[PDB]
Design a protein. Structure first.
Lengths: 49, 48
């Protein structure tokens, strides 16, 4: 019988294997609703005549 | 109104002189904002 929840051992002295890394995963959702979140929009100069 | 999930909000504001009913006249409604929500609404109520 053991505890399912344990704590990280993060210490600056450990090697790159045990070093803490922040992993933020980007989750995309697609439904019948319109897309309200998109990338940047680049523009150029306007020329006339 | 709801078109393919787009909520189209139309608005017009003008002063009138009205005893009761509706006045006789013609006016056009300008769009306010477009809400890309896309949820189904089968009923509505008025705020008190």
């Amino acid at each position: 019988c053991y505890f399912p929840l344990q704590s990280y051992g993060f210490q600056p002295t450990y090697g790159v294997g045990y070093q803490p890394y922040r992993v933020v995963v980007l989750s995309f959702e697609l439904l019948h609703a319109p897309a309200t979140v998109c990338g940047p929009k680049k523009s150029t100069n306007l020329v006339k005549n | 109104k709801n078109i393919d999930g787009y909520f189209k909000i139309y608005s017009k504001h003008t002063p009138i002189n009205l005893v009761r009913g509706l006045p006789q006249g013609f006016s056009a409604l300008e769009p306010l904002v477009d809400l890309p929500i896309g949820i189904n609404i089968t009923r509505f109520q008025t705020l008190h």
